[PDB]
Amino acid sequence: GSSGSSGLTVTVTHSNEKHDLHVTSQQGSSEPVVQDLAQVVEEVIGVPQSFQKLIFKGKSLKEMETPLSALGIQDGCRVMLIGKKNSGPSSG
């Protein structure tokens, strides 16, 4: 058979748990970058880039324009995310 894809399958741990997410390109860039990774989270997990903190290999990923490949991330990896998820009765 034949198998292949563009995006990448990387898990993102936030709430002392693991959340598998599928990263994809920005319908324009040959390959997806950290930027997308951050979005996939706020879009999947539910945490804003202002509350979530990316961390890989003990390094806090703070670069979006940077390719996930450069940081060392690639289809089949586990990224650590530090932040607060929408939990608890909030009124305002």
> What is 37-63 written as a DSSP string?
HHHHHHHHT---TTT-EEEETTEEE--
Contacts of 25 (CB under 8 A, 6+ apart): 6, 7, 31, 32, 36
C-alpha 26/C-alpha 33 separation (Å) is 8
Beta bridge partners of 2: none
CB atoms under 10 Å from CB of 20, counted, come to 10
* Experimental technique for the deposited model: NMR
- DSSP strands (E only) in 1-92: 8-13, 18-23, 53-56, 59-61, 77-82
C-alpha 83/C-alpha 3 separation (Å) is 35
Please give the CATH number for the structural domain made up of 8-83.
3.10.20.90
Judge contact between 52 and 82, C-beta under 8 A. yes
Contacts of 3 (CB under 8 A, 6+ apart): none
